[PDB]
Amino acid sequence: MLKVIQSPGKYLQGPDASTLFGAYAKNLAESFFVIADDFVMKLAGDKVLNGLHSHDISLHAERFNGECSHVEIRRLIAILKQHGCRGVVGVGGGKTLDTAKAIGYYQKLPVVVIPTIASTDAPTSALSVIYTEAGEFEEYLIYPKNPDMVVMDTAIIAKAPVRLLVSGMGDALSTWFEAKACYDARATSMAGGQSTEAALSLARLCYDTLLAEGEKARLAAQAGVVTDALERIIEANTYLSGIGFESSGLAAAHAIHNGFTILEECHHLYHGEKVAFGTLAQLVLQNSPMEEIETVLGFCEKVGLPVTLAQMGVKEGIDDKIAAVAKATCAEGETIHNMPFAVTPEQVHAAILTADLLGQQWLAR
Amino acid sequence: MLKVIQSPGKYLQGPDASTLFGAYAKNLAESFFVIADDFVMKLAGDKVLNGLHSHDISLHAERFNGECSHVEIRRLIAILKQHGCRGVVGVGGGKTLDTAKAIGYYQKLPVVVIPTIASTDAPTSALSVIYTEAGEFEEYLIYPKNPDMVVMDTAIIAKAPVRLLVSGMGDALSTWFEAKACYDARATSMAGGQSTEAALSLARLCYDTLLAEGEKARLAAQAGVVTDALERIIEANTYLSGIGFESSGLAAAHAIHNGFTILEECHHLYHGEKVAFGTLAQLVLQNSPMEEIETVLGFCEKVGLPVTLAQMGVKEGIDDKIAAVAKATCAEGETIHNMPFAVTPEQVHAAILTADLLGQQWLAR
Amino acid sequence: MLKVIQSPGKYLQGPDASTLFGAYAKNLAESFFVIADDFVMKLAGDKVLNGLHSHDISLHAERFNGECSHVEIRRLIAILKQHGCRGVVGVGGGKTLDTAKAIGYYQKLPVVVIPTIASTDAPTSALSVIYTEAGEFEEYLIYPKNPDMVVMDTAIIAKAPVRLLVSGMGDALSTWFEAKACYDARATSMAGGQSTEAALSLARLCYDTLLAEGEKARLAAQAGVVTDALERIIEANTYLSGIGFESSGLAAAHAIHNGFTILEECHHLYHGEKVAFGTLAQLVLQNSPMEEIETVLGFCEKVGLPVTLAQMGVKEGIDDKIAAVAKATCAEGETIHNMPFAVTPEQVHAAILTADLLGQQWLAR
Amino acid sequence: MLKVIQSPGKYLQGPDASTLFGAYAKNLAESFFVIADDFVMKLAGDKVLNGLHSHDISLHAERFNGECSHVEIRRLIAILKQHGCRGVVGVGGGKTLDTAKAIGYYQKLPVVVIPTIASTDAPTSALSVIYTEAGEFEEYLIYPKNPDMVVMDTAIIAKAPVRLLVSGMGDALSTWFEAKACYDARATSMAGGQSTEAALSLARLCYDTLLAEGEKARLAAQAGVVTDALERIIEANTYLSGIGFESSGLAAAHAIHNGFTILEECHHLYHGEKVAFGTLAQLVLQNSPMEEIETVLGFCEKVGLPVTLAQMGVKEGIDDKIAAVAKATCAEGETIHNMPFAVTPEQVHAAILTADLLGQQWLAR
Amino acid sequence: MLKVIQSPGKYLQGPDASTLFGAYAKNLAESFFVIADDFVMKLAGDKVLNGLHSHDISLHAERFNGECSHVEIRRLIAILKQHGCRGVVGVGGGKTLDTAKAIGYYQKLPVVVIPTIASTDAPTSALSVIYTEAGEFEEYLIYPKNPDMVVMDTAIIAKAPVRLLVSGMGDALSTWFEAKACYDARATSMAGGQSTEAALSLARLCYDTLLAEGEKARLAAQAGVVTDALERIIEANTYLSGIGFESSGLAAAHAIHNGFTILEECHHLYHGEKVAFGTLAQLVLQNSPMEEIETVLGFCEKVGLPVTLAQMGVKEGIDDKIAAVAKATCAEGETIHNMPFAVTPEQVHAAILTADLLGQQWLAR
Numbered sequence A, B, C, D, E: 001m002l003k004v005i006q007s008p009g010k011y012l013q014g015p016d017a018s019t020l021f022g023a024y025a026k027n028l029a030e031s032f033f034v035i036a037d038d039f040v041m042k043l044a045g046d047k048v049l050n051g052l053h054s055h056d057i058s059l060h061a062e063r064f065n066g067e068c069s070h071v072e073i074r075r076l077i078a079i080l081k082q083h084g085c086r087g088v089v090g091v092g093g094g095k096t097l098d099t100a101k102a103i104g105y106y107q108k109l110p111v112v113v114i115p116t117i118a119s120t121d122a123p124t125s126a127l128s129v130i131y132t133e134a135g136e137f138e139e140y141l142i143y144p145k146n147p148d149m150v151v152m153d154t155a156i157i158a159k160a161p162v163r164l165l166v167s168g169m170g171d172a173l174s175t176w177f178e179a180k181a182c183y184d185a186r187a188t189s190m191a192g193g194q195s196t197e198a199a200l201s202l203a204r205l206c207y208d209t210l211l212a213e214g215e216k217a218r219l220a221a222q223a224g225v226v227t228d229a230l231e232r233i234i235e236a237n238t239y240l241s242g243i244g245f246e247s248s249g250l251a252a253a254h255a256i257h258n259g260f261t262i263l264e265e266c267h268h269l270y271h272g273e274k275v276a277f278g279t280l281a282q283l284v285l286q287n288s289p290m291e292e293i294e295t296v297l298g299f300c301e302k303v304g305l306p307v308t309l310a311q312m313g314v315k316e317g318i319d320d321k322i323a324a325v326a327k328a329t330c331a332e333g334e335t336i337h338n339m340p341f342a343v344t345p346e347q348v349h350a351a352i353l354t355a356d357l358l359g360q361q362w363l364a365r
């Protein structure tokens, strides 16, 4: 088999990156179609447009309705065509960025993504999560190409609610364990082959960076301020975790996250918070040693990530609900079959319940 | 002298093992005489019979009265003869399994033992503990042959009361210390010679597995569920501890257990719980270092095993009762004379009292 | 998803074990059919018969023609039937012992094997290598049952040519690496399921024992004498390696050994010598680190095992011959498909040639 | 300079040693003059006499008035002469044993000392502490010869009040630090020269034994019972500490002990308890590292030895009283001048006050 | 079950110790009977007499005939009686010192031993090796009492042939291994009981001192000069090894030494040289790890001690001669039965031959 790794063409990160990226963007296209929701358009949109203008780039800004749907994509494409813009910029959260990727794909245009929050590792991926207009999940669009640019303005990201950065560390904490499980399993990644050592090494660096820098970063983020620990964690959360999942692989943790979406009590939790618990379930599943379980429990408690079912809103009917979560986890096509051993709905149910009891004892010690 | 190790022919372990063992059983005999108490016959008996039938094996199931006595053996043998069954299956607890071994021995038939609980290391041994009909101990029957098969259905074992699995870890915790004491003493085992390195290595693996996996297993067992930590502990409790005691040796811990049976206050405690304290007494007896005493104390407290006389129901008249326990420990034929130094009833009394004080201080720290 | 481990009922080892095993044999049967070639019958046959007689066991000794063939089995069975003997004893090398196993299987009788040489790990297995009368390989007979007894007289084994004990260490050196490769691959063993920790632990102990004791044992064996290092190595070579391969698994090393039997220049080499080189090829195949390659190279050179193609008699036409060896290694049903990654005839050819170059450089340093 | 080490001829230790030492005593003399106070004469005197009689040794037992004075020595000598006894046995505490040494010295007779308590390291020394009849210290008599026998019956010693054994560990804890300070200083010992490595090594073993065995011993002593930890601590307290101080050297700790005898508030404390604090003062004096101070503080707190002035009864007028203790410590002839650096009454005052503050903080943490 | 340690009253060591010991000797007796051979009487006798005279001690010097025989003892006693001397001094080698001990024993007098060579650990022991007038071994006289003084003049010892100091290190190298083997075996020592930790600790210090200081000392001894490495080795060779063997125990090494005295080819070797090889045989016998065998081989080669039979003069008829040496080693009453396992003449033969092969390979590497 071939080893494959993919990457966005360029990844930029630092103070004022949203006003400094024009130099590199100029070489991608002579004009850009910029999208954002109204909140983000007023916060960072006006600065981005002024900066792109200062490098002699023609722009048309347009409002995003808040959902990454096929209808919304086609509506914005129609406006893009009318103006004849040669690139696409997305500014804001996950749904905005994913819509910018789709527009770039269908129009064969270069894509710039400018996350204003560091809460997922989606920004670097050649992936969009497609929703209906009502907000229910529909499908995944996997693209041949990653975004041409990823721009992380850490002055803007620092001022976002601390909870979002913590959810980002929860999403990133899973990367080493799922990557390493795919590596041991010889499981294919989204890149299309086995893992390179490069991708797996960055998966591991992600994890060591969270342990080294996670707490120093969270406190800087709490204050609303930019330190080099936050810079390291933003890179961990975005570039290291992003290359890690796409080119090394997903496994149990993210399958269990998808299993938990069937319970409405978990809908108040962010993507990465559920993944943090799912990682803990994966550790019990692959029988990681106790001091490894304790470092992850210790990390999660310290930063504010859920280590028990109760912290995820599941308080009643546990046996039946976890059985249902376990079945949906092991559904055909799910990433849990990338584990290097046999997984059954019984053994995922087992892992989730034991993980919960490990987290209860830990919080009560 | 010769080095000797003995083993059951085959040891099977996993989910649904009680319905999957027919493939291997078919080669031992064309028909089987299956025994169990009424509780166990309804819980796991009907599945075992259906599974054996599916591999074309003729069966007659018969009720076990609950005591491993000579009278009960002879009653069941008489029924076995009437049906002409070519093998014996025991399903259930210690007394049921030991009766199946005796029947197999006296009739020269192959034996299958199917423990539904993982609370002792007896299942693999060529040993039966014989009782009177009233329930008083009578003698030990040591056989030339181990059971031909040992089948551990971990889905059934997981659902047993957690206390039984913990008592099993208490019985297993003694194996390394008594094995190693017989090895140092050059003391003969039940196998009939000195210890092989194989048997001693498995004795040590038993101990390291308890420390590594014991807590993760207990919580899975608490939830009623099967994890790979429980699988490791069930193997530790059954195969590793079983080969360990029979082919490496018993020593102080089990002699002290036998010493404690003279006190009626200890009759509510299970075999392995008393052995856990007896192991602690052996550590003080052989003067193991403090951090070794602390790892065992720490293990016992954490899982729920007695580290003090009070936790074993001995609250009054301590000096006189421990003196009597000390005398009965050093009785002729007891395994404490396998220690690599001189033991007297005074020095066992000493060890028990000091161990108690070590456990009090530990629980109060 | 069952874990399985199998074992011979009893394994005996020490000085004069061939004259002391009657105590345990008496409980298996009241009479024994003893087989050996003429060389072995005069060396150790007369002592074995006198010892069995001293424990009141009836015997008939019969001559073995030197080949483990279906014809030879049926000839000896016919004589066994005429005398009405209730057990089978084999004394001597691999072909004698394997014929005793077959006789025991087809007649449903207990089996005692008494290896006079410690050159393979076959003695404990439920396996016979069947040959034609001319000496060409025909098939494998895998039995449900292991030998009931394995008796290792280390006074007799010590006096055998040193080369045979060294070939035994070469066969045993492969056990950890193939076991561990099956464990990582989740590959089924001859026992019939996944590996227990017991079997894998003994596989590892085999390897550590060779490194610790291998040189001290070889020199004792050179002198013709019994030390406790030789006792440890005889156990490593027989019990530890035997449980290791049968219940943990075979993989690349033994498949490559089978690949080399197509070259007539290798026919002068013993089983375990070819396995030692095959293990080296497996290390390059699974990309073990250099320090691990160097410990194995260092061990092999020191004891006298081949680390280069030239030491195995392959001097000319290397590219074509190794290509043919590589194809036969990857034949359907071979144990190389138990590796935890994709193996092709190209990558086995690659590994063998690189291993050869590693061994040349090592010998010339 | 010469290196010198001295020792008692024989040191005996174990259960029932006071009734088993007759075999060795028989070779020293054909008759013995035995002394003890009335309490000790009834407790252990009658057994000792019966045991000496059983090895055919003539005896006269005589009462000791309780003080090691010149008057008492001369009174007992006069009675010894009247009976014509050829040896001397002392049974009991320090003052009894020291009087037996003096009698042996002045009469040129062999000496046996039988400590019934393990609270000082005096028993092995060629030293007697001479008092007036009223109980005030008078002088030291240093002898050319050590006791010919030292007999430690650990069954009798175990039953003594726990506080005495703890005071013995306090006296012994000083041995390594004062020995090592004399070794570094090249200071002469009572043996008469520099330290041998033997004596210094035993000084160090004393210290490591207290840390390893001190707590296990104290609890056995609390219960009134004999374990091998108590045996190790009795040897540490008596033989290891005894050879340590006499043949390696005393230094600051014991000088400070002598300094504290000027304060009447300290008269309720035993010799070794004051030495334990004096050792702590020596650590601050020689500027031992913090983790060394913490291991000694930790040891002292755990066993029950004073780490503060208040625990020694000094609660008021601290500055003036410690100044007076500091002057008396640095008096001409004191062992503090064996330190490897300049000591002044100011720097001993300093050390004592800082040590006190280290002990307060430690107890309050 | 008593622990016993014995010692000489005082041990002196340093430059000019033979002229400085009078201070301590004066307190033992008012006059001394001094013995030495003519060589030693002229070398160091005249200085010793002048020094004893300077402390006002009356002396009569008398010539020693060179053999420690009953006849020689009785001849010198008769002269001692005529002069009425109150003590005994021996100056010179082993036979002189042992005769001084016997004279002191039979006359009930104090003993001073002044070894002019550091080649054995006999000087401190309560032991004399008795010979016939012709020089054949007769018996051992074990005394109740050790020498009252042991005086080591390191200026005199330094000038002795280097070979003698090296033989002393060979005798001392065995002490830890035989002591530790008696400790593990719970074997009684010459002191009369089990080992104290003191005696075993000094046994170990002996061994660590040889490895640390042995080479630096040998070169100083080669030059004829006194360094502190030589002082450490003289103490190791005399005090540490002496307390080690007498109060901890002898085992295989010294039994094998006694076994080798039956071969006339070994009569040119000194006591300790044969013990060095015997220690190597003990390592193979107890199966010490390879790295430990290599440190001892490395030490022996470096200093000049035999590691092969050929270096001990055994070149021909090896099998038969080593068999005879093996039988005489295992004779009833020999110290090899203090090993913690079964020893047979076959397994000592085995160990000696394998040790030889280990030493050949080592010298040829």
Ligand SMILES: [Zn+2]
Binding pocket: A120, A121, A171, A254, A271, A275
């Ligand atoms: Zn994610």
Ligand SMILES: [Zn+2]
Binding pocket: B120, B121, B171, B254, B271, B275
């Ligand atoms: Zn048990």
Ligand SMILES: [Zn+2]
Binding pocket: C120, C121, C171, C271, C275
């Ligand atoms: Zn093989």
Ligand SMILES: [Zn+2]
Binding pocket: D120, D121, D171, D254, D271, D275
């Ligand atoms: Zn003191």
Ligand SMILES: [Zn+2]
Binding pocket: E120, E121, E171, E271, E275
């Ligand atoms: Zn010696």
